[PDB]
Structure 1
């Protein structure tokens, strides 16, 4: 009846152990990336997944992949578990919101049972060929490439290579497309220098859609081989379509869709079903009409249902389940959604909420549920609704482990596990355990210290004012915006906030950023609706802050990203011993040959292949992971070597380089970034989202002052303790005082309190918004009665 773990040594697990009670509401929190989150993510979940997947069918076990065994000694009292992560999937257009909502099939069954034609339940579905629209083969649209995007260079000759698609080059002899181009030219007797615009329509059709698969001879003359073969040219369009059909990568899919556009099927149009299916009328509405309705209006519509007595009797189960699913969806809070809406077009938090609602509807109790950041992407009322839903799910009879930072969740929690006190070598130990009251009584918990109010976010005594430099965006009607006009000043720590799903963040991410990037940084991406933008001359450069990893290659290090490695190499080159040895400054760098270990090429790992086992990585024995030649490593400066510096700690580095101001300024920048515990040479892939964000903000701070720069941060409060939030707020204020501009779209109460100009967009999400709710100083905004954000700010202040 307990989750007992002993001898855990994952990452920074200092052989910690704890007894987790079953069938309760326990929350684990700590410092940003302190290791408690990693432990909870990768010890219990990994043990359960291994103990389950293995015991399953062997073939399915290798199909789903063999999970790596953990370093924990033994785990007792475990159970099968599910993970509601934050990394969404592109999925396929065949997937639908109703399909993943576990409501489309129920709606189809209800329509088949109760609805009348103007009758098999299979015909109501749109995934089986027994009832499909042939025009779009059930897809709803028509993914066709754009002839104006593949080879728009009409004036360019055929030999010039107007078509820029990969594998279709015509100016390269070594290209695989050169043989096909030569065969087509032989079959057409047309000069390759003819312009694309001047090409005959028949020749253009043959090039695009192929030569109807007729027999044709293609000549091949390689360096050491020659001959000819009979084949057919499908054409550029057909080749691209086949490649897209055979594609299985999200990046390749996005690249291919960049040159294509799915034209909504005109025959069916949001139906993807046979005409006669729409004839089934239930309550004077169609299945598509029901699906396109909003969740709240759908609940209202199904509440006013009225039919025959037999229909009511048969509805004692189907309609009851439909009502329960609608109520669960309402409790999720994502009312600004449609059953017919595209599954892919959704936020990560929205996807997590939808998955939670589907799990609640399923009712599979007696399991372990591990969620991540439920508070992210929700308003205060949404937080209350999520807490109620979590309490209900716990009442269903399962033990839940959540990781978050919302104070209300901790108050509603039963047992709290805190790991600290610091991060890395400064933490990794269980500070305390028990309920909230004794956690507050505990004087060794940083979370308890923040709860007790000893350290609190003091509201600023003074607020900055605009300097007359404003950016004007008026008439934008992208997504759900109803031609809204917003006056956004620049030069202060202003922010935009509102209820969940209002779309203001979508507007900022899809219109303003795209326009600014196209204007300044020359980014060729089509933006959304945009009438006019003013104040363009005020700013010069714009940058973005996201959660993307700094680098996907192991050839990069955070020291390289910050550039301190260059100063270190220069200092090493300035050494008298280095000058005597004649070593170049470039030799003190692992990225290039000259000093790197030739055995592993500086990678530090070796690949070993087995007949019945996958690739195995082991440390390189020649250089023992030092990634430096012995002769190069023989140099010593101030009692330290280049390898030692690369393996050194930032906390030690700050005290080490007390006489190197050039390096020191970046050192103290990194220290003020609040990431001194991070290794100076940690692997780039090993970095977490918080670490990457800290690195990016440190790099931004180290940048020279310009006074005409703007920054956009997407939910910086995600994955951060209250002290981390305070540090981030201080960094934001110092960046604003530097002379740049800050744009923030978040929902943290402390961040809103620290703001100087609040922008409100509402008054409801989805179709219920599109108008600027209010604007002004936070004190003036709190005076507005018709604003949830204003009421929350007034309560906070």
Structure 2
């Protein structure tokens, strides 16, 4: 009844042991990069998945790949583990929302059972019609499926789009003309799938059937209603069953997977979730928590990595890691219920939970200086031809419920148009007329969690530009002048100073007969990426490799004398990356580390006062202290004369914003409008706004 883990030394874990209770709601918390995500996914999920995959067939196990064995002594009390995260892929066009949620099969069964046959030539009711003289075969569930030759459209082989343009025959219905003739309640299968989830649930609720039809089709109706209710309680009440799976975002895919797992009813499975509440409005938090509790009540163990206060208060057991990040983290500081953590004096989460540390609402807010950005005729996706004014020089937050269209309206329209107008891009913008006020801006930079590189030749030091200064100060030493060296000698990108064996990468590729490529450190350079002649030069007792190896915190004291390097190192420390090292490969950096590197690079630049920054959910996977630091950094950037636009669902970040734009009042076809605009105080006075109500409650 316990999951005993001993000798966990994965990544930065400091040889810790823990006993996680089974069949309970367990939440893991900690600072960003403190090792909680590693401790969960790389140890427990990896072991649970491997112990089940290895027992399967040899062909399937090899096809799925060989998961790396975690550095753990022994794990006791383990079950097969399923991980849900925002890591979806396009996969294939054959899969849609209905197929993933396993409701299309029930729809096919219902249409085969109580469907009403019809003639596609004469339009009358029917197994043959005396008017059109056409004979039809027996009704089977296989006919309504587009994955079989009996029902798939012959022109587009049941894909709905010739390889992409829509199929002219079925117009994307993915089914034969004869199959679509069968209609239930005046709507065929395609029309039912085209409806929204809530609309479909309402239609099924009030559907009228005869006594025989109700008697024969009851379990199917019950299952369909239960699955639709699960989907609604999850939060995706605006989606359509006919939507392709690839087009869904990470959060939508994760929530769909959660709903499918709830519907399946699997028992004795360890579920590991990575921030289920991300990309979700505050009003859906209670429903999400209820859904999580319902999933747990099926006989499953829940391991949720969430920093939400409501999730903390609704959990059974909380495990806190820290007290810092990187080399300062990897230890269990607090453990117990929420009350024990709140009373714990050495817990980072408890300090914010008890109210000792909190984000203070500013007493003064900036005002626009007559410069505005106007968007005219925004009609992309569900936008109802609205016009929005975005003030310049202030901190602007775009709020609204999920599916309101804020992410599309920002990313696919404003950022694309600004990039085309300023950076001379080659990407088609969204459906809009024109943008007024572009001349007030000079450049636009988008900050996200995408990796900063794909090769080991890119490092945070090189990205921030401090590597050039380091090379110059190394070449300015007495030894370099004596030996006639150049500033480019101390670089792993130009031949002459780097090691020729690994070409400056520091690693070598070894190919096995029946195994994938394995990367090992270079033997000639011992992973130092430099030859002996270059490494012979030392400045202040340290060489170039030693300088690259040390962390930002050590570099702060080491480079106190040089002001130009000191400024960049101080910026990197202020963006919260004091534990990282300058020589770390960009391929190993996480999303948060890459975002912090980009923020530090933007801060170090000489702002001209005509720069616009766009951030899409910057608080993904961030603790309360990380949120406070990010708010401070954003406020500093705004005070630097630039403009910041952030799409955020966190109330703490929202309450500190200067301008708020609300999109709603619902999601999907029910949204795309503008509800409230202005300062947070003004928005809090709007009655018909959920964000306004939550802001009024917070303030």
TM over 0.5, shorter chain: yes
TM-fit CA distance, 1:294? 1.1
SS state at 2:178 partner: helix
CA contact (8 A) 2:145 2:151 kept: yes
Determine the C-alpha separation between the residues in 2 that align with 1:616 and 1:356: 35
Report the alpha carbon displacement of residue 477 of structure 1 after superposing the two structures with TM. 1.1
Post-superposition Cα deviations, 1:646-686, rounded to whole Å, max 9, x if no partner, equal 11111010001111011111111111111110111111111
Contact persistence 2:239–2:668 (CA under 8 A)? yes
Aligned equivalents of 1:758 and 1:464: distance in 2? 12
User: Alpha carbon RMSD of aligned pairs, Å?
Assistant: 1.1
Change in 2 beyond 3 A, CA 1:792/1:538: same
User: Does structure 2 conserve the Cα–Cα contact (< 8 Å) formed by 1:270 and 1:288?
Assistant: no
CA deviations over 1:226-268 (Å, ceiling 9, x no partner): xxxxxxxxxxxxxxxxxxxxxxxxxxxxxxxxxxxx2222221
**How many Å apart are 1:478 and its aligned residue?**
0.9
2-side partners of 1:22 and 1:30: how far apart? 21
Cα deviation code 1:185-204 (max 9, x no counterpart): xxxxxxxxxxxxxxxxxxxx
Task: Describe the shift of the 1:142–1:587 C-alpha distance in structure 2 as closer, same or farther (beyond 3 A).
Answer: same
Q: Per-residue CA shift, 1:545-583, capped at 9, x if unaligned? A: 111100011111111111111111111111112101111
CA separation in 1, counterparts of 2:654 and 2:19?
A: 38
TM-score, normalised by the number of residues in structure 2? 0.96
Partner secondary structure for residue 389 of structure 2 = strand
SS of alignment partner, residue 353 of structure 1: helix
Structure 1 Cα separation of the partners of residues 524 and 379 of structure 2: 62
C-alpha displacement of 1:130: 1.1
SS of match in other structure, 1:131: coil
CA distance in 2, matches of 1:264, 1:415: 51
Deviation of 1:138 (Å)? 1.4
Distance between the aligned counterparts of 2:9 and 2:672, measured in 1?
52
Structure 1 residue 602 displacement after superposition: 2.2
C-alpha deviation, 1:532, in angstroms: 2.2
Mark the CA change 1:608 to 1:472 in structure 2 (over 3 Å): closer, same or farther: closer
Runs of 4 or more consecutive aligned structure 1 residues displaced over 4 Å after TM superposition: none
Tell me what 1:553 maps to: 455
Indicate the SS of the match to 1:376: coil
What is the Cα deviation at residue 136 of structure 1? Answer: 2.0
1:374, distance to aligned residue in structure 2 (A): 1.1
Q: Distance in 1 between matches of 2:530 and 2:65?
A: 36
**TM-superposition CA deviations, 1:140-169 (whole Å, max 9, x none):** 1223xxxxxxxxxxxxxxxxxxxxxxxxxx
SS of aligned partner of 2:334: strand
Tell me how far 1:616 sits from its aligned partner: 2.7
| Alpha carbons 1:140, 1:269 under 8 Å: kept | yes
Tell me if structure 1 keeps the 8 A contact 2:13–2:329. Answer: no
Name 2:100's counterpart in structure 1: 100
| In the alignment, structure 1 residue 123 sits paired with structure 2 residue 178 | no
The DSSP-based 3-state class of the residue aligned with 1:126 is: coil
Cα distance in 2 for partners of 1:543, 1:467 equals 22
**d(CA) in 1 for partners of 2:424, 2:507:** 40
Give the Å deviation of 1:33: 1.6
**In structure 1, which of residues 268, 280, 283 is the aligned counterpart of residue 185 of structure 2?**
283
Deviations 1:663-711 (A, max 9, x none): 1111111111111101111111110000000000000001112111100
1:275 aligned counterpart, secondary structure: coil
- Deviation track 1:614-649 (CA, whole Å, cap 9, x = no partner) reads 333222222211121112111111111111101111
Deviates more, 1:306-315 or 1:730-739: 306-315
Gaps of 5+ in 1: 144-261
What is the deviation of 1:55?
A: 1.2
Distance 1:123 1:50 in 2: 39
State the aligned residue count.
679
> Shift of residue 43 of structure 1?
0.3
Deviation at 1:382? 1.2
Contact 1:555 1:603 in 2 (8 A): yes
Alignment deviations for residues 195-234 of structure 1 (CA, whole Å, 9 cap, x no partner) = xxxxxxxxxxxxxxxxxxxxxxxxxxxxxxxxxxxxxxxx
CA contact (8 A) 2:345 2:351 kept: yes
- Which whole-Å CA distance do the structure 2 matches of 1:551 and 1:615 have between them? 20
2:4 corresponds to which residue?
4
Cα 1:613–1:340 change in 2 (3 A) is closer
Larger Rg: 1
- After TM superposition, the structure 1 stretch with the greater mean CA deviation from structure 2, 402-411 or 48-57, is 48-57
DSSP-derived class of the 1:291 partner: helix
Corresponding residue for residue 26 of structure 1: 26
Q: How does 1:314-333 map to 2 (within 5 A)?
A: 314-333=216-235
Please say if residues 495 and 744 of structure 1, whose CA atoms lie closer than 8 Å, have aligned partners that are also in contact. Answer: yes
Decide whether the 8 Å contact of 2:351 with 2:357 is kept in 1. Answer: yes
Equivalent residue in structure 1 for 2:308, among 400, 406, 418: 406
CA distances 1:517-562 after superposition (whole Å, capped 9, x unpaired): 1111111111121112111111111110111100011111111111
